[PDB]
Design an enzyme around this catalytic site. Structure first.
Site: not given
Ligand SMILES: [Zn+2]
Ligand SMILES: [Zn+2]
Length: 218
Positions: A77, A79, A81, A140, A171
């Site tokens: 995804h 994000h 990280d 998520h 989060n």
């Molecule tokens: Zn994430």
């Molecule tokens: Zn993550």
């Protein structure tokens, strides 16, 4: 299980079996996991890391150790990280596979764009190593995918899947808590015999991690 760290101790790789290792890095003090697939056509990562520096260090570490080039990465995804090292990948000519949605969301977050080449179910093959990518629905994040190794019955859950030690969902700013249970169930329905599950953060486990994530959604 073998574990190799880097000089600072910011990066570890640790073996699941012959050609499958977990990678773990620390960013700002937060750990993050992906996979390293040692295949006969090169190294394939599931996910990069938090930023360009750690991604460079990751690649340097696995290329030395396995004595072949990182050829491909799967982005799970958009994000930091997962996609943080995308510039390193593109400038080295490492192919960054993703869904179209993950690519858009990447651009929207101001990252360089991955390939957008994965569909809802994509079956890839690198050397002898088979890999399935599956979009089970929103959770998520809107775009989160899982990665399945059918030869090993190993599932990379990413951040869709919480570790046993996680007491909450983390989060949820970009989450869909009401779709997240259905999406987990879709994983359970597709992958009915699982030997190990790699969560996005925290220790490796089995299907209990998916049930645990279900409980945290209640
Ligand atoms: Zn994430
Ligand atoms: Zn993550």
């Amino acid at each position: 299980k073998t574990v190799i760290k880097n000089e600072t101790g910011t990066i570890s790789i640790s073996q699941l079996n012959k050609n499958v290792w977990v990678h773990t890095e620390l960013g700002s003090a937060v750990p993050s996991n992906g996979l390293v697939l040692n295949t006969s056509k090169g190294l394939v990562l599931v996910d990069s890391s938090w930023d360009d520096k750690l991604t460079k260090e990751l690649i340097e570490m696995v290329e030395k150790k396995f004595q072949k080039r990182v050829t491909d990465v799967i982005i799970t995804h958009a994000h930091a990280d997962r996609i943080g090292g995308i510039k390193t990948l593109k400038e080295r000519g490492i192919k960054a596979h993703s869904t179209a949605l993950t690519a858009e969301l990447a651009k929207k977050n101001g990252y360089e764009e991955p390939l957008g080449d994965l569909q809802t179910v994509t079956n890839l093959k690198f050397g002898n190593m088979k890999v399935e990518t599956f979009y089970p629905g929103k959770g998520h994040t809107e775009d989160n995918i899982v990665v399945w190794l059918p030869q090993y019955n190993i599932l990379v859950g990413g951040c869709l899947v919480k570790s046993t030690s996680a007491k909450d969902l983390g989060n949820v700013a970009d989450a869909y808590v009401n779709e997240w249970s259905t999406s987990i169930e879709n994983v359970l329905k597709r992958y009915r015999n699982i030997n190990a599950v790699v969560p996005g953060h925290g220790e490796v486990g089995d299907k209990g991690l998916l049930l645990h994530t279900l409980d945290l959604l209640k």
